[model samples]
Target: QSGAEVKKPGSSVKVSCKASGYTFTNYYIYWVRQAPGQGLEWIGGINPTSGGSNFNEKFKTRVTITADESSTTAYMELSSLRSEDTAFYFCTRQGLWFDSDGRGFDFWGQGTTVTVSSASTKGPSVFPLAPAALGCLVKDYFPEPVTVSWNSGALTSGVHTFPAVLQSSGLYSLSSVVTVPQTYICNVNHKPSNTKVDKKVP
Candidate 1:
């Protein structure tokens, strides 16, 4: 019941939550939304038995809430979609003791992502924009137990050795506090990848 969906702006979407094991009409099915890099907002909720519903003031106009006991399902539909509607929608069972020890919502569906993209959006619509492939910066080459020492033999003036980070591919860069061309030579010593190398920066 939870997966991503891509839709064009101005299109409408109907998301659903099918319930089981309990009487779906006994409690309210609450709908929520969490946008990318944004906080969670209550969209609205519905009573399966009464067919009555309530919504957040911000979403009152464009959203509709409904449910069906026969199929044990709760539904939320957003009409006249926009980029602002791109977010994960959720369905929850509202606890009424009107409350419970597990807060108000007793059960929750993972989430269904709705991405409303504009017509000008190019190529494949990759939501949450992920990194394509792994290529370390500068074609990483040095990847291991490499050691280093200074040219002036460990002078104490502003000389601090930064820890060597294990790059996925190789060690493309090493950092030391002191600037080069005056007091030191960055000697990379690794017997495995082949011998000692030094760079005297020009």
Candidate 2:
């Protein structure tokens, strides 16, 4: 598990879980959602090795569960997002003991917090600084793992750095720096809508 995903209303996002330290397929992966200051609500469960899944009645139609055994990862795609979707999402392992009837969430990954709000539509800003330097900053985004990419006229020799910080408003602000040839382009990929913001070196 990574961190939180910040999305806008009417958007969609996918959260993933990677398993290790044991046989990945021996147990089931379950997802739970907990809103800020609230209790846990089961979202769904999936068998990574079989691609079989069972979801909560309230979320069955709004989420898609999938897994890749080769990568030992499970993914949950949530769509038609709303403010109510804002919550801390967690992936837990079920079926550790026989007494639990294969329905126990005994192991959990650090939760991925998802925040849905109207303020999520803003994009990042790009700044072209002194000799051969470029900076891209993304702010006020929720439920994260935002992807940043750089293109500089097909030149791949540049060094790119990413340093991200979480904000007090439960959002994330990301900064990427690149030192390269004179011309460059930066892209910020926001997951919710698969939206991308691109800026060219000026």
Candidate 3:
């Protein structure tokens, strides 16, 4: 690739690539790191149509990635940078694959990191995406042993805190404030009753 343009942080630029001879919608666009002498680190990947991104659990908290299926382009945003955040970021086309009854990442990205030494700074304070609100209530009555998990997508049991209640009927009702909009799924299994119910919070 000759005369290719490179992007630097603080000085923003948009990168676009055309899907000349490939299926754009079915593939995921990944943004990854490529250091001069190191292994690749996954920053994030996005499904063009859904605009849904699956990021490295470690990196998702701080970075943002966006995709445009119509235009066949992807964008990434890195905020409040430190020297540790610098890396080469690359984009790769990844497809969904299943093997041995499991799903995993099979494709990758080539990354480049730009440097930034100074910028206006803000104090350290935690700010949630959305304020707490009523999300859903889930209950189950099992005659046998089982496990119960409540999640609001990215936020697990801890980050998205919820309360539990034992009804007069002996059933359990757990309520929580959902700041994340991801689907809430409950998987339950009862042995003696031999019942299994999977519910998605509506």
Model 1: runs farther than 4 Å from truth?
A: 21-23, 103-110, 119-202
Candidate 3 Cα errors over 4 Å, as ranges? 1-21, 97-113, 118-202
lDDT of each: 0.59, 0.69, 0.47
The model with the greatest lDDT is: 2
Each candidate structure's TM-score, on Cα atoms with residue i matched to residue i, is: 0.54, 0.54, 0.42
Cα-lDDT of candidate 1: 0.59
Of 2 and 3, the candidate ranking higher by lDDT: 2
Model 2 poorest ten-residue lDDT run: 97-106
Clashing residue pairs in candidate 1, if any?
A: 96-99, 142-171
- lDDT winner, 1 or 2: 2
Q: Mind giving the per-residue lDDT tens digits that candidate 3 earns over 1-202?
A: 1012223344443333344224355666777665535687777878776777788887665677886666666777765555555455566665644223221222222223343333222111112223345333334432212333454133464434334454585443454344443555544333323444444555
What is the C-alpha lDDT profile of model 2 across 94-133, one tens digit per residue?
A: 6533344533443354557688866554444444443456
Q: Kindly list the per-residue Cα lDDT of model 1 for residues 16-133, writing each as its tens digit.
A: 8767636474566789888877998889988776788998998888899888777887889999998888888878876432654453443354456676764221111111111212
Evaluated at residue 1, the lDDT of candidate 1 is 24
